[PDB]
């Protein structure tokens, strides 16, 4: 059974945690303990091929800025997350991708752009802006909602598809 080492990156106050938590946790249990091992591992079926997702989310450690390279090098694919109510977090994505390209030492690293919607304030990054940015990098854009759990599966599953497309090519 193939295992996919995924890594979540982005600014703080983005909902990086909520994205990964909502993937992992059962659809109708609002509960989580990040200390146990099932916290970051999920068996899933994507395009009829069973696989194991290993998600690294280091949310809360953004101030340890010199540890990003270390954490990033563990990944095969990356979710670059911004918040649709925080323009700065969207403008930061360029740096994260450039850092990922440097760590992995590759121009095409499996990658998806994710715009997360939690609660107020209101949207400042229109989906068109993100679709355009994603197109310039040659990667998928997925928009997700922390409240409703919409988009969460699609975001991770798309990354897995990008990893599979990269491994043939």
């Amino acid at each position: 059974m193939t295992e996919y080492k995924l890594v979540v990156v982005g600014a703080c106050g983005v909902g990086k945690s909520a994205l990964t938590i909502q993937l992992i946790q059962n659809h109708f249990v609002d509960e989580y303990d990040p200390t146990i091992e099932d916290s970051y591992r999920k068996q899933v079926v994507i395009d009829g091929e069973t696989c194991l997702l290993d998600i690294l989310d280091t949310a809360g450690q953004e101030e340890y800025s010199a540890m990003r390279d270390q954490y990033m090098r563990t990944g095969e694919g990356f979710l670059c997350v911004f918040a649709i109510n925080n323009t700065k977090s969207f403008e930061d994505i360029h740096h994260y991708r450039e850092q990922i390209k440097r760590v992995k030492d590759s121009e095409d690293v499996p990658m998806v752009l994710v715009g997360n919607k939690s609660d107020l304030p209101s949207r400042t990054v229109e989906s068109r802006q993100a679709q355009d940015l994603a197109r310039s990098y040659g990667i998928p854009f997925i928009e997700t909602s922390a409240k409703t759990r919409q988009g969460v599966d699609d975001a991770f599953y798309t990354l897995v598809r990008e990893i599979r497309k990269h491994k043939e090519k």
């Binding site: 945690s17 938590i21 609002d30 509960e31 303990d33 990040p34 989310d57 280091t58 809360g60 450690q61």
Partner: peptide, 12 residues
């Protein structure tokens, strides 16, 4: 830091 954040974010 991560464990406190995820605990507070992942529970209502």
């Amino acid at each position: 830091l991560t464990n406190i954040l995820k605990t507070e974010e992942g529970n209502p």
